Design a protein around this nucleic acid. Structure first.
Lengths: 191, 701
DNA sequence: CAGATGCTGA
DNA sequence: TCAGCATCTG
């Protein structure tokens, strides 16, 4: 549901998103990630060639959205002067600096900002899976890391039977059996 | 009385010049370096004067304590380490005397405002050759410049070859030590050569030949090494300066230069390059062990394991299976031995005959042999009491006065010096070592009316040890000649820094820019440039550990509740920058499984968060000063249930959401295998469905 | 043959 | 995250 400004016609970042549909519209920000989340693409080469390009845009943007996320991609072999100026501009203004290294990384950043309107449960996928799977028993950090490095996804773990989980050493077959029994057991009664 | 307080005649002139005016003393590879430190420590070993040690070693501290206890000092020097509480250090620093502290605790104790200052006489700097780089030793010297009068600093060093390095000037190291004058006492001096000329022993050099088979083996090894070097240079013309010819590969500073030139290991990843490097290392260690040890252990203990390693896989490379076959014939036929043992036996028999012929009204001498390592010493001790052929047969059938002491090893040289001083020998055998030669020269010059000691030399024809000893002497002479020519050619701000953040290079460079440092204990944050901003620094390795455990969110939610704009700084590396992206999972996942993915959610949940990036520690030091152009100075005084809980932890759920979802579905597999259309139809909000699809469907890479 | 650290309970 | 207990491993 993202809206891309018509000024970003020849942008390679738009050809990297596949899991999120996009559209066009006469909107002031370049990228609108839902609501109160505006993104702005800017490369280091364009900033070095045209120094009076991001200041005017930041001054004309104003204070309309709640949070402003300004992403920048580094391409200079010596990012010691432009990076400091960008950090100073982001500190003086009200925006968040995001460092990128490739257009695919910028597309990944956009797709991540688009679909993270969830609750603040973060109190890498290994950390997320070891925080979301530790609520049930027979799952610790080591077991979560082993299940991530041996399977790679939750579908292959929930699709396997009890005998297919008793071949990994370091956790025992009883722990896997108890985990499967806790997982496949329903909570609500039949009604 | 092992400790000698008086010095020689050539050493009394320096103490008269160093006591009045402070300066840097550079010895000639240990030309009385410790003898001057021990003399200077006794002059300030009083409870009234407080003298702290900059940096020393635990092996020398016990020896110095034993020497001072033997001398009979009324107050023994103490040692402060990380073995007691912080409050217990207030009584040790106030008692007085020489205190042997560490290089890491001295900075924290000085910056924690708990050291009894305004009464310290000075600090003796030992081994000043390590202050060339921006290490933690410079911060102690920078913080010490706080006394108006009676402030002195004495720096001692004995490594003159360390100064002969490109992109490293002597003036930069001299300006970082607050020393104006500079002293020097090389071997080419007149006062040192005139005193050591009347006391010189009689050294006898004996050239030992080699067997013809060993010469052919060395020639084949050199040919294989040259072929490998040519093959490496043909497939890699970039690192041409590191390997100019085959002579540099035989030298010692070869592996260091190779590791320095081949810095981008992840960029030049190649099987052929790694195989050639391993082959070069194997050819080096084999040529070293062939000349260091016997030939039987070269074939039975070295040539046997390499064949099995090559037959097991591609560890040693397959290019050594159909090449250098003649080396397998000369090693198996060797049977014979090396002429070194024969020369040693001949020297021993000559010494025995000389002692027997001069046994009338004369006491014999205790001849001792010196070994490079413990294995060579054990081999020499077992060969004498058994024999040559007997030992050669025993080693082949196993697997299928006159005191020997090693020289190089983990043992401190003080033990070897005490052993050599315990018994006075008459004929000493050396391994062409410069340190042992200097020690023998000093021993002979210390005792004028002593017995004439004879030092024997063992140098093989065209050996690596002789070339190394010649190159080291040439480098030392060049460094001395360069140092002689370089000598003969001459409103403030405050920043609150955490105590636990003093090991980084940021506080060492902050005080150098000119701004002051007002540190104090705290609980949240690391750097505070203004009372309305708090900065915390995270490296490329600590950020992952802080984001996986969850302490980062707790620290961020506890800082924004009181302060205005809490920001953070991320320190990365420009040489090896982490892409933070999965190559094998970017096509099978919805942009997940990344640290940046969690960082985005963290910076989105907290709108008052700024993400800073710096490629080098020199950039953040300037960024912290640029942000204080008009900001005021901060003050120091203001510083059934199972599946329920399983579904509750899922992203994109809520109380009513879970209550409505559990009433429709029963198992988790049905909703896991189903698409997001039904999930967004039964709920309405597509964001939660997208979050669930991104979480439950992802790939690992 | 025998002791190591995450299951069990909240 | 804090008291008892057993799987596979040294």
């Amino acid at each position: 549901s993202i809206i891309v400004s018509p000024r970003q016609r020849g942008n390679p970042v738009l050809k990297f998103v596949r899991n999120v549909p996009w559209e066009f519209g006469d909107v002031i920000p370049d990228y609108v990630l839902g609501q109160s989340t505006c993104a702005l693409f800017l490369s280091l080469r364009y900033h070095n060639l045209h120094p009076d390009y991001i200041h005017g845009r930041l001054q004309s943007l104003g204070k309309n959205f709640a949070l402003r996320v300004l992403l920048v991609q580094v391409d200079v072999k010596d990012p010691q002067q432009a990076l400091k100026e960008l950090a100073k501009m982001c500190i003086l203004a009200d925006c968040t600096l995001i460092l990128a290294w490739s257009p695919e990384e910028a597309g990944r950043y956009l797709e991540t900002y688009k679909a993270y309107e969830q609750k603040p449960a973060d109190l890498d996928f290994v950390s997320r899976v070891t925080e979301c799977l530790t609520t049930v028993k027979s799952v610790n950090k080591t077991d979560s890391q082993t299940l991530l490095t041996t399977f790679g996804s939750l579908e292959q773990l929930i699709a396997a039977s009890r005998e297919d989980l008793a071949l990994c050493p370091g956790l025992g077959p009883q722990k896997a059996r108890r985990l499967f029994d806790v997982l496949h057991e329903p909570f609500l009664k039949v009604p | 009385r092992i400790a000698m307080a008086p010095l020689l005649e050539y050493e009394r002139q320096l103490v008269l010049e160093l006591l009045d005016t402070d300066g840097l003393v550079v010895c000639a590879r240990g030309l009385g370096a410790d003898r001057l430190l021990y003399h200077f420590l006794q002059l300030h070993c009083h409870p009234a004067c407080l003298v702290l040690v900059l940096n020393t070693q635990p092996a020398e501290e016990e020896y110095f304590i034993n020497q001072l206890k033997i001398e009979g000092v009324e107050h023994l020097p103490r040692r402060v380490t990380n073995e007691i509480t912080s409050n217990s250090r207030y009584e040790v620093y106030t008692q007085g005397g020489v205190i042997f502290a560490t290089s890491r605790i001295l900075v924290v104790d000085f910056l924690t405002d708990r050291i009894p200052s305004d009464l310290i006489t000075g600090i003796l700097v030992y081994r000043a050759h390590r202050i060339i780089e921006s290490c933690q030793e410079a911060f102690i010297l920078r913080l010490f410049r706080q006394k108006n009068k009676r402030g002195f600093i004495k720096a001692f060093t004995d490594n003159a070859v360390a100064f002969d390095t490109g992109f490293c000037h002597v003036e930069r190291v001299m300006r970082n030590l607050f020393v104006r004058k500079l002293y020097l006492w090389p071997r080419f001096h007149v006062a040192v050569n005139s005193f050591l000329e009347q006391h010189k022993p009689e050294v006898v050099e004996i050239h030992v030949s080699m067997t013809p088979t060993m010469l052919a083996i060395q020639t084949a090894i050199l040919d294989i090494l040259n072929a490998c070097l040519k093959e490496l240079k043909c497939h890699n013309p970039s690192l041409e300066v590191e390997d100019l010819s085959l002579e540099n590969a035989i030298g010692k500073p070869f592996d260091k230069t190779i590791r320095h030139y081949l810095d981008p290991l992840w960029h030049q990843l190649g099987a052929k390059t790694k195989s050639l490097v391993q082959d070069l290392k194997i050819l080096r260690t084999l040529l070293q062990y062939l000349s260091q040890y016997d030939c039987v252990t070269f074939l039975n203990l070295l040539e046997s394991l390499r064949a099995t390693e090559k037959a097991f896989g591609q560890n040693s490379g397959w290019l050594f299976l159909d090449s250098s076959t003649s080396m397998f014939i000369n090693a198996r036929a060797r049977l014979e031995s090396n002429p070194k043992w024969e020369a040693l036996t001949e020297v021993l028999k000559e010494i025995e005959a000389e002692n027997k012929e001069s046994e009338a009204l004369g006491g014999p001498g205790q001849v001792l042999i010196c070994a490079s390592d413990d294995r060579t010493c054990s081999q020499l001790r077992d060969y004498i009491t058994l024999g040559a052929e007997a030992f050669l047969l025993r080693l082949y059938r196993k697997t299928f006065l006159t005191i020997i002491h090693p020289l190089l090893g983990c043992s401190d040289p003080y033990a070897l010096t005490r052993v050599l001083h315990e018994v006075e020998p008459r004929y000493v055998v050396l391994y062409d070592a410069e340190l042992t030669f200097v020690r023998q020269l000093e021993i002979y010059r210390a005792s004028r009316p002593g017995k004439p000691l004879r030092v024997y030399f063992l140098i093989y024809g065209g050996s690596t040890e002789e070339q190394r000893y010649l190159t080291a002497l040439r480098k030392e002479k060049e460094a001395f000649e360069k140092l002689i020519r370089e000598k003969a050619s001459m409103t403030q701000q405050s920043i609150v820094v955490d105590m636990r953040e003093f090991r980084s290079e940021l506080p060492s460079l902050i005080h150098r820019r000119g701004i002051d440092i007002e540190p104090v204990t705290l609980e949240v944050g690391d750097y505070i440039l203004t009372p309305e901003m708090c900065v915390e620094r995270k490296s490329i390795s600590d950020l992952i550990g802080s984001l996986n455990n969850g302490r980062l969110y707790s620290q961020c939610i506890s800082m924004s509740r009181y302060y205005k704009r809490p920001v953070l700084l991320i320190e990365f590396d420009p040489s090896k920058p982490f892409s933070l992206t999965s190559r094998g999972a970017l096509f099978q996942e919805i942009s997940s499984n990344d640290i940046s993915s969690k960082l985005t959610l963290l910076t989105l949940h907290f709108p008052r968060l700024r993400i800073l990036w710096c490629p080098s520690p020199h950039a953040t030091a300037e960024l912290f000063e640029e942000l204080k152009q008009s900001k005021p100075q901060p003050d120091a005084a203001t510083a059934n249930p199972g599946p329920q809980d399983f579904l509750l932890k899922m992203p994109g759920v809520n109380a009513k959401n879970c209550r409505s979802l559990m009433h429709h579905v029963k198992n988790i597999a049905e909703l896991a295998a189903l698409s997001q259309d039904e999930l967004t139809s039964i709920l309405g909000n597509a964001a939660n469905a997208k979050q669930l699809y991104d979480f439950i469907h992802t790939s690992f890479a």
